[PDB]
Design an enzyme around this catalytic site. Structure first.
Site, PDB file in Angstrom:
ATOM      1  N   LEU A  38     -21.511  32.699  -6.754  1.00 54.79           N
ATOM      2  CA  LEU A  38     -20.096  33.017  -6.673  1.00 54.79           C
ATOM      3  C   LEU A  38     -19.404  32.124  -5.654  1.00 54.79           C
ATOM      4  CD1 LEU A  38     -20.210  36.930  -6.687  1.00 54.79           C
ATOM      5  CD2 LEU A  38     -19.804  35.406  -8.622  1.00 54.79           C
ATOM      6  N   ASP A  39     -18.112  31.911  -5.871  1.00 56.78           N
ATOM      7  CA  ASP A  39     -17.280  31.174  -4.940  1.00 56.78           C
ATOM      8  C   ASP A  39     -16.984  32.062  -3.728  1.00 56.78           C
ATOM      9  OD1 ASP A  39     -15.728  28.460  -4.944  1.00 56.78           O
ATOM     10  OD2 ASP A  39     -14.227  29.915  -4.277  1.00 56.78           O
ATOM     11  N   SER A  40     -16.447  31.449  -2.668  1.00 58.74           N
ATOM     12  CA  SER A  40     -16.103  32.201  -1.465  1.00 58.74           C
ATOM     13  C   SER A  40     -14.994  33.208  -1.742  1.00 58.74           C
ATOM     14  CB  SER A  40     -15.680  31.242  -0.357  1.00 58.74           C
ATOM     15  OG  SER A  40     -16.703  30.319  -0.048  1.00 58.74           O
ATOM     16  N   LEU A  41     -13.980  32.796  -2.514  1.00 60.21           N
ATOM     17  CA  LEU A  41     -12.861  33.672  -2.851  1.00 60.21           C
ATOM     18  C   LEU A  41     -13.308  34.854  -3.701  1.00 60.21           C
ATOM     19  CD1 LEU A  41     -10.212  30.940  -3.831  1.00 60.21           C
ATOM     20  CD2 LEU A  41     -10.418  32.118  -1.642  1.00 60.21           C
ATOM     21  N   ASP A  42     -14.381  34.674  -4.477  1.00 60.70           N
ATOM     22  CA  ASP A  42     -14.980  35.783  -5.209  1.00 60.70           C
ATOM     23  C   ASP A  42     -15.543  36.825  -4.254  1.00 60.70           C
ATOM     24  OD1 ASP A  42     -14.361  34.465  -7.572  1.00 60.70           O
ATOM     25  OD2 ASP A  42     -16.282  33.403  -7.604  1.00 60.70           O
TER      26      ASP A  42
END
Ligand SMILES: CCCCCCCCCCCCCCCCCC(=O)OC[C@H](COP(=O)([O-])OCC[N+](C)(C)C)OC(=O)CCCCCCCCCCCCCCCCC
Ligand SMILES: CCCCCCCCCCCCCCCCCC(=O)OC[C@H](COP(=O)([O-])OCC[N+](C)(C)C)OC(=O)CCCCCCCCCCCCCCCCC
Ligand SMILES: CCCCCCCCCCCCCCCCCC(=O)OC[C@H](COP(=O)(O)OCCN)OC(=O)CCCCCCCCCCCCCCCCC
Ligand SMILES: CCCCCCCCCCCCCC(=O)SCCNC(=O)CCNC(=O)[C@@H](O)C(C)(C)COP(=O)(O)O
Ligand SMILES: C=C(C)[C@H]1Cc2c(ccc3c2O[C@@H]2COc4cc(OC)c(OC)cc4[C@@H]2C3=O)O1
Ligand code: SF4
Lengths: 82, 156, 110, 98, 114
Positions: A38-42
């Site tokens: 997952l991305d950081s914003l996720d």
């Protein structure tokens, strides 16, 4: 919010509502960046979904260090009694 | 025939009522509003033609875009125009409302209010004089005078 | 009877002109438009002061309702009592206005 | 007895049952209270005129004045309730259950 | 190469401020869809916020991302306060703009721009 097992199951239920995560590879010790991919914003919107369901604010400095559901339920348990 | 003579006289009646009771909004933007005030001033005197300024756009009949239209105000102009009951008319006053004017190549200017609202009369000038704006209003009255609404309603 | 005929005629003319205003230009089809304010969407905050001037109107209107039979009461044979009570009622309206004054009730709509 | 007195008493009892059965609003409770006052005004006037009892002609004015001051008092109480809670809904007024 | 900072000493505090700006936009999207009565959904608006945050995902300068946070907060305050109209919010959704030719061959077909 009463018992620790309900808090852990509610953490996992907030995560399994979050449709980006594959629910098969989801565990209690699954890592967001390298296991879930997952991305950081996720992870940030996961933290805000945790606030949507658990109803208490989390500062940014101790939300960056929550890289698994076990760290999330430990942070919830540290800010509550259980 | 009888019904066509009836709708012709009713067209003359309603077009007479619309051309001789024009209510423009007191909606200025720029230098053209000064000369539009001079067209409201005692010499040229729009009021003797049945032409009175109103503040709310609900009781207005013609929107005189008197001035430069910027990008920041183009949705405001379109919303004000959308608040008007029909039949409503647009008179474009001056070069910046007509085509963009002296600020045509600018980053923040709408290049003519006819990109935004359906302009019926284009009054040219910088600013056009109060005599020229009143000429544009009289040409708008001639344009409303030759509308054929009930003739086309009868013949459609 | 004549009053009822006049009321019915005036009400009929009002309703007839409103029918002509809501159905003769509504014979037009013109165009299906959408039309998509100082306050935008937020709730209108209550004004304590407008309510207080409405209540002050209501109480002075009741004091007026007491004062209205004075042109009939001037005809009485007990004129000293009538003059005393009339001056006392107008005095009580004045004292109500004075207490509205001095306790800052007539401020920002004075 | 007289037929119109039945109607005025029934209007009083209908405004009673409106007051005696809240739906949501407190303004509606005040309106039912003043409908009760209105029916009392009409009924007093019909009695006092049918009696030709001259001195009680001033009584319905006294009823109207005292109960309009009563209504203004109730409107001020409603205004303070709606300043506390934002609405004049009666379900906001249950903090005195305990 | 020693410059004066704006707010952030290094990229960690910078990413913290970026993260708090993203939290504010994520919370503000449903209120923006309601009080502007947009025809978009909340998930679609949040994907546009994600697209606009990921458009500048490569900057490793603290001052530039501080100014990006400042401009994002200006967009944010103009969205929270009713200052934008419907159009200024719907300009992020380039809906009237037809989707441009993407590959080589279609841009070859339609004109001269590379
Ligand atoms: C109280 C005394 C004063 C009374 C008011 C003044 C007297 C005259 C009243 C009748 C005026 C005409 C009808 C209302 C105005 C209609 C204007 C118009 O454009 O109508 C087109 C409309 C509709 O025409 P349309 O179909 O062309 O509308 C445009 C539609 N599109 C955009 C799709 C092309 O006509 C009507 O609705 C007909 C109304 C009756 C016509 C006259 C019949 C006899 C009436 C007596
Ligand atoms: C303060 C009040 C000042 C005015 C007092 C009344 C003046 C007056 O005319 O009184 C005579 C009036 C009427 O008397 P009268 O003088 O009109 O008598 C004529 C007789 N009639 C009216 C039947 C034809 O009142 C009384 O005599 C008794 C009533 C008033 C009693 C005191 C009231 C105030 C009590 C405060 C506590
Ligand atoms: C027995 C005593 C009553 C006799 C008349 C009965 C008439 C029929 C009424 C049946 C009940 C209807 C009802 O739902 O009343 C409750 C309602 C308040 O409830 P509400 O908040 O509107 O809805 C949530 C549900 N409790 O309350 C109301 O809506 C109150 C309405 C009162 C109006 C009365 C009108 C005259 C009725 C006949 C004469 C008495
Ligand atoms: C309705 C729609 C409205 C949309 C409006 C959106 C607001 C636009 C404001 C944009 C502000 C920015 O772009 S600040 C981003 C700049 N940051 C950087 O250059 C540093 C790199 N940042 C990242 O990689 C970010 O993903 C994180 C989350 C900070 C770190 O992730 P990495 O670690 O994995
Ligand atoms: C109402 C009558 C009879 C006159 C006065 C008047 C108009 C028409 C339009 C306007 C107006 O006055 C107001 C106030 O004064 C200015 C002064 C302005 O510039 C000096 C200006 O520039 C856009 C705009 C305005 C208003 C404007 O739109 O007709
Ligand atoms: S057309 Fe010219 S004179 Fe007229 S308002 Fe524009 S800038 Fe001013």
């Amino acid at each position: 919010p009463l018992t620790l097992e309900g808090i852990k199951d509610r953490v996992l239920y907030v995560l399994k509502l979050y449709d980006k995560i594959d629910p098969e590879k989801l565990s209690v010790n699954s890592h967001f960046m390298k296991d879930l991919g997952l991305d950081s914003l996720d992870q940030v919107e996961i933290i805000m979904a945790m606030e949507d369901e658990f109803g208490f604010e989390i500062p940014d400095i101790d939300a960056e260090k929550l890289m698994c559901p076990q760290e999330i339920v430990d942070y919830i348990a540290d800010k509550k009694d259980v | 025939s009888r019904g066509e003579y009836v709708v012709a006289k009713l067209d003359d009646l309603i077009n007479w009522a619309r051309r001789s009771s024009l209510w423009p909004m007191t909606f200025g933007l720029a230098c053209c509003a000064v000369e539009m005030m001079h067209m409201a001033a005692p010499r040229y005197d729009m009021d003797r033609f049945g032409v009175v300024f109103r503040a709310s756009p609900r009781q207005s009949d013609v929107m005189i875009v008197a001035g430069t239209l910027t990008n920041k105000m183009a949705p405001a102009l379109r919303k004000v125009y959308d608040q008007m009951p029909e039949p409503r008319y647009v008179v474009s006053m001056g070069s910046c409302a007509n085509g963009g004017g002296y600020y045509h190549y600018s980053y923040s200017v709408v290049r003519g209010c006819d990109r935004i609202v359906p302009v019926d009369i284009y009054v040219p000038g910088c600013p056009p004089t109060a005599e020229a704006l009143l000429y544009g209003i009289l040409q708008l009255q001639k344009k409303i005078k030759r509308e054929k609404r009930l003739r086309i309603w009868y013949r459609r | 009877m004549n009053l009822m005929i006049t009321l019915l005629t005036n009400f009929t003319l009002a309703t007839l002109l409103v029918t002509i205003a809501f159905w003769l230009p509504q014979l037009n089809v013109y165009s299906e438009k959408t039309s998509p304010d100082p306050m935008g969407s937020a709730r209108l905050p209550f004004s304590m002061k407008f309510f207080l001037v409405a209540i002050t109107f209501l109480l002075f209107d009741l004091e007026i309702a007491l004062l209205l039979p004075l042109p009939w009461a001037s005809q009485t044979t007990n004129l000293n009592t009538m003059l005393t009570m009339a001056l006392l009622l107008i005095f009580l309206l004045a004292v109500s206005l004075a207490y509205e004054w001095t306790q800052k009730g007539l401020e920002w709509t004075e | 007895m007289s037929l119109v007195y039945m109607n005025i008493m029934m209007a009083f009892t209908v405004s009673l049952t409106g007051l005696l059965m809240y739906r949501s609003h407190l303004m509606s409770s005040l309106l039912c209270l003043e409908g009760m006052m209105l029916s009392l005004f009409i009924l007093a006037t019909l009695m006092i005129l049918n009696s030709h009892f001259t001195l009680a002609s001033m009584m319905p004015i006294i009823l109207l004045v005292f109960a309009a001051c009563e209504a203004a008092l109730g409107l001020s109480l409603l205004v303070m309730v709606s300043n506390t809670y934002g609405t004049d809904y009666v379900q906001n007024l249950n903090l005195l259950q305990c | 190469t020693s410059v004066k900072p704006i707010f952030s000493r290094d990229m960690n505090e910078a990413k913290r401020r970026v993260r708090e700006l993203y939290r504010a936009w994520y919370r503000e999207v449903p209120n923006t869809v309601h009080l502007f009565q947009l025809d978009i959904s909340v998930k679609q608006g949040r994907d546009k916020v994600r697209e606009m945050f990921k458009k500048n995902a490569h900057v490793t300068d603290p001052r530039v991302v501080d100014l990006l946070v400042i401009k994002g907060k200006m967009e944010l305050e103009e969205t929270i306060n009713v200052w934008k109209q419907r159009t200024h919010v719907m300009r992020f959704f380039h809906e009237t703009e037809a989707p441009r030719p993407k590959d080589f061959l279609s841009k070859f077909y339609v004109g001269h721009d590379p």
